[PDB]
């Protein structure tokens, strides 16, 4: 989001309450659960009004408190993790014995 | 009631539809294991300057 | 160093119990209550006779 990235858990992503969509890169996507942004406010049982609730960017940044950031900018280069390997040193030579 | 042009007194229904347009979405992308490239750098204690 | 972001969405959910008041020109509040005494000594009804 907004030139930033994080390695979130898949289920946690699927759980958070924001209107998602198919993400097929087509135009005019249809968003599911639109009620999470609009807020209708019946004042005195006289009439009804609609609000859009503004930008969730700051709240989303807070809701990533345990995530690990990576460098998506440039080449999607992940710089967090670990790896295990074993080293076969049978073929090495010292180059200095002689 | 009568003040709103309706003869019957009571509670009336009401709907409010509004077209919702999205600006600046958030993309979520998976990674497949046939396109992941680890990189290991190995350096010998050559004693280089 | 990274700026956190825009706290409007978090503010809107941090105000989830507050009461809205219309603010355009005069800040005409519409929620509240008032206690008033009604002194009806001088008050009469038309056409009793």
């Amino acid at each position, epitope marked *: 989001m907004k030139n930033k990235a994080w390695m979130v858990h898949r289920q946690w992503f699927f759980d958070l309450p924001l209107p998602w969509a198919s993400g097929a890169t087509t*135009e005019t996507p249809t968003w599911n659960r639109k009620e999470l942004l609009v807020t209708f406010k019946n004042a005195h049982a006289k009439k009804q009004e609609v609000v859009v609730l*503004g930008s969730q960017e700051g709240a989303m940044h807070t809701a990533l408190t345990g995530a690990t950031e990576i460098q998506n900018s440039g080449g999607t280069s992940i710089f967090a993790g670990h790896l295990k390997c074993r080293l076969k040193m049978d073929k090495l030579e010292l180059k200095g014995m002689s | 009631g009568w003040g709103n042009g309706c003869g019957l007194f009571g509670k009336g229904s009401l709907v409010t539809c509004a077209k919702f347009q999205c600006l600046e979405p958030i993309e979520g992308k998976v990674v497949q294991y046939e396109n992941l490239k680890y990189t290991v750098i190995i350096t010998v204690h050559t004693g280089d300057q | 160093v990274v700026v956190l972001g825009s706290q409007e969405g978090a503010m809107h959910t941090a105000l989830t119990g507050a009461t809205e008041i219309q603010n355009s*020109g005069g800040t005409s509040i519409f929620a509240g209550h008032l206690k008033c005494r009604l002194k009806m000594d001088k008050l009469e009804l038309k056409g009793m006779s």
Partner: antibody
Amino acid sequence: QVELVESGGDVVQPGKSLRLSCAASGFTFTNYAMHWLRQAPGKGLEWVAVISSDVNDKYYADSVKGRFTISRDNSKNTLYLQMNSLTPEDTAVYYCAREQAVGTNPWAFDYWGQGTLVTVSS
Amino acid sequence: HIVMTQSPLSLSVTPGQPASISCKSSQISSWGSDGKTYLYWYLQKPGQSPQLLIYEVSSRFSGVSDRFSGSGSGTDFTLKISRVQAEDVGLYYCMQGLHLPLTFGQGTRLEIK
């Protein structure tokens, strides 16, 4: 933080067509309706054309209707304006206005481009 | 094709003083479905590009100084400045967004008296 920079403005003789280009940055382009506006020197601001979020829907000002064409290259994050049958009257500083960030109107202006100058004269 | 007529064409006022600009419409720009009034006020500073001061009749836009406030209900709208500074030189073009062929006003001019 959004940046709208003009391009394509230059001199041109009457009757010779010209294609204007509005490069966009700082926001997701495909979700925003875009506009073209012009200000002739010493004259009031005059809106030219609008393209909505869906590419197909377009509208033009009647004073320039039938002479211009507006296109959206949202894959490259840029806007295209095609000016045809230019008149010596059709010389002005041309602007590129974004859709409103917050509001109710489907089309409004909140951020204006730096501006380009096109001169139609002999 | 609603035509916007502005009452003042030149407003020379000393600093630290109020100012009232009027943009009178040829038709009520009050959208029936929502009850809002779509009248916008821009300011193109000399040698600059136009900004957006009040993105409605009276709800000012973000980044705008505290003093800019509007009014008006059906056709007689106003732009009130409380205390004029030296930066207020410009052209206060009003606009109506009610109808698709939206048209600006001629735009007043403000200078320091």
